[PDB]
């Protein structure tokens, strides 16, 4: 039973780690996306010249 309570402790650890890290990474992806947008315009311009020889 004490092992089961320790399992509950580790389960709360995965709860907090999963939730907070997933929130921060879901924020990180948006941060990098909005950081990329000017460079995605530059990248589209780059592809345009490459595919027009």
């Amino acid at each position: 039973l004490e092992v089961e309570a320790k399992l509950a402790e580790g389960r709360k650890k995965i709860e907090v780690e999963l939730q907070e890290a997933l929130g921060s990474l879901e924020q990180q992806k948006e941060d990098t996306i909005k950081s990329l947008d000017s460079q995605i315009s530059a990248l589209s311009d780059d592809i345009v010249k490459k595919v027009l020889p």
């Binding site: 004490e2 092992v3 320790k6 580790g10 995965i14």
Partner: protein, 61 residues
Amino acid sequence: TIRNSEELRGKAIEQLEKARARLKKVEMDADQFRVNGYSEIEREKMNLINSTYKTLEQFEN
């Protein structure tokens, strides 16, 4: 009388009291039988916790 009154009395007392002494000896080996499992089954708690700590470490991975 002379032969049997000693040939069945004294040896019977000797085997009887040596049987109590042998009981004390095997009882001492039972006090050792305490240790035979006890020092390890006091650990078996941390054994079944720490052996699965490595699977929980795989869970951490």
